[PDB]
Design a protein around this ligand. Sequence first.
Ligand SMILES: [Co+2]
Ligand SMILES: [Co+2]
Ligand SMILES: [Co+2]
Lengths: 467, 467
Amino acid sequence: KRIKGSCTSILVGKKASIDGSTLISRNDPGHEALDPQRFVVVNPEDQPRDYTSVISKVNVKLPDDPQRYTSIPNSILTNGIWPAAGINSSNVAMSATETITTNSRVQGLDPFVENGLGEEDLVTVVLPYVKSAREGVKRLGSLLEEYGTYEPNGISFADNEEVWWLETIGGHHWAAVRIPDDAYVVAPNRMNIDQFDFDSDDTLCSSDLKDLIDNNNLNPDFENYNLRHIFGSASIKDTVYNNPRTWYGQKFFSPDDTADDPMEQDLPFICHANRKISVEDVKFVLSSHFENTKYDVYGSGSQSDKTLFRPIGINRNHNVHILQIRNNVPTEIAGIHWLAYGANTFNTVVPFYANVNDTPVQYKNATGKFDLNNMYWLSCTTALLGDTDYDFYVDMRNDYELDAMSAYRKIQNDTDADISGQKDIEKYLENANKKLADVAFEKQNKLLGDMVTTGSNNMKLRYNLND
Amino acid sequence: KRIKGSCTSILVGKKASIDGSTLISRNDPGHEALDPQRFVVVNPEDQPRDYTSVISKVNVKLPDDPQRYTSIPNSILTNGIWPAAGINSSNVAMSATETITTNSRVQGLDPFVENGLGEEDLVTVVLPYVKSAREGVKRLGSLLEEYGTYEPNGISFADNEEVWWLETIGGHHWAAVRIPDDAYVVAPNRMNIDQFDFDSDDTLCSSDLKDLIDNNNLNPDFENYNLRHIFGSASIKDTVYNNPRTWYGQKFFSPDDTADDPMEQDLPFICHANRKISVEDVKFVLSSHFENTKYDVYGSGSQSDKTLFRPIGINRNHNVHILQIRNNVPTEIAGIHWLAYGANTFNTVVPFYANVNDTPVQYKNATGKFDLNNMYWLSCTTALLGDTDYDFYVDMRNDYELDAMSAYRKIQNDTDADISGQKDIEKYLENANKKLADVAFEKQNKLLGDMVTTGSNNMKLRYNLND
Ligand SMILES: [Co+2]
Ligand SMILES: [Co+2]
Ligand SMILES: [Co+2]
């Protein structure tokens, strides 16, 4: 047995969002436990042409024309801080942090390959060599066929037009679905793809997948093809660890199409919300642990409805990551990395422009010993002070996030609105990303001050007396 | 009154399964507690021609042409280790470990015969002399009429075409139903056969059964014949000990045709699933404790709608045995003994080929004192280590079972795919069986290492903390 944790992905098609962007997202648990959030640029320079896989050490030959891409690194690993997600210079987004499920019937036919690729390799070997989400699908599929994989994975791709969800199937097979423009998906650590039309333009798969199913008695259904019925799981672990997370998201976006059983094994894959979806919505769902009277995590009653469902995106590590490819803006400022910051219950997402060659100084320094001029330690301070009397800080937490998002959006809007006469767009965007980093810091500083100010004024008469 | 245990049987017709096989199954009563369980081949020589019944010592003369059959034994008795189930060289499967019920009106007419056959005799005196599921039914019926029985029993027979369920009735009578091709049955320790057509090609019974009923006011119903209404029980014990097990299986396979009362006395015998049934499905149901939200064994809060409704297969004594006769392959490799291994919450089923003259060296040795090279002792260790922190080990346990099953199926598929050019099929299958026993061992060995490794690092920062 080995490594890896719990993740929830939300995909939004370009007509399903409030601003016409595509959205792919994820929340992330860490394995060891320090979470300084960094984002990194990988220039064609730094891209290997003879790549060696992280766990398996197999050697992979990569094309010689890699695109610059921005990367979001991860946990403790067995070989270097591999990219979990990213946006390349063609505005293609990819995220490969969603472990899914399988079953023993297909594994008996196409087993995990112990010397295969793992999810740690996927962004590196796919993202720099494709100019569309759909190319991302075909290239990854072709690489699974060639090198195999030792894991069950779900991978999201997006560009300004399309969103694709790819699922690996056994050691070498795969299947993928184009999310409709007006649709959204909530996907936990369980194989998600349901009804599947091999003919469709909206689908892609191993060229032998249908024959693989038909010739080996893999299909449990009397009619049609449901890929997660065929290749996935419907286990006991799913009902408490995966399905309630799907259910919760679908209850939020589609309250009138979603019944009341968080354990349901056949919640639809593709959904239609009753309204357009914002970045704030996605952030909330990826942050929120089922909270209305039902399933806190936790407080006032019940706990006969509790302890045994799985919180999102809290257990914790709490990093929400949202990749947005916008429309109706010049293509050079379209790619946005909404990066987590962080941390505890005081996390926000900061909208960095992805189209840059260098990063704000904060994300290459240390992050050595405690220093309140450093964003990490300031966050840790705010985090720790937060659990003092935490529902004395619950209402100033919501104001903090609101006020910080507001400040981030002001910068994004001002930057977008003044793009037209700029002679150096890349430096222009570097400067915006540095304004964002600065206000993210200033906001948490204002937060530390407000907590201490009102805390010292409450602790003062939690000690009881006088007029 | 005297000996015996709790059993649940599941029967699947050849069009009801995912792979075109017939399935008969049972989970296994603990006798006392010796649960290293054997796999045994019985050659025609070792078959008595003058058989002596186990308890009653009555003498039964058997034909002189017995077929080779594989047998699955037990522990404690007053005489030996009788075969509970088996597959013969004609690919007929039989299982006789399902005690049922009766009533005083039929017993008042045809009492149990104190010196008759009991379930310990049935496989031995039926299986070696029949070439079809249906012949097994006719022979058992004839043997009950002749020697009588002291018990109420349910017996399943299968070949590659048909599945039959026979129920003994009083001292000498019996009735049997052919399970339809597209149907399945969940049958606990209660007389199961309901609506009954004497005329039918799909039924067999005592030639006087209808007359017995009509002439003795045995029929409680205004119209037609329901055999368990007439001959069986609808008792208080049935509502908590039998019916919930039936209900649970029917909820799992036929969720939209099954209501929500587990105590229901009139759940149908024959059922139609909403999907095709896998070996994995059958294993899960025969293993599973009634879970989720309502009634575990045991759990959530608060424990009186959580009950005297009892777990199958937790009492505990979890040996799942599935007899499969495949179609889809040559007849020489069609009979599969899915055998338990085992044990505690750490059991899997291994698909041993039944068409062999010898058994893996595993099931011929001692079974002496503690030795970690022995499958039994290795199993006890992982089992005991399992109840330290039982849901620190539950998620690596679901992966253990999944991963072992996959490795088994890989071997099964490879063995099957290369059968046509084999010159010594018997030696070929013995070798495959030895691969299976080995990998099952190897897989349990890897589990011990993984359990100890993760255990050694979690209880170790019961430090209560810090990096
Ligand atoms: Co067509
Ligand atoms: Co350009
Ligand atoms: Co039918």
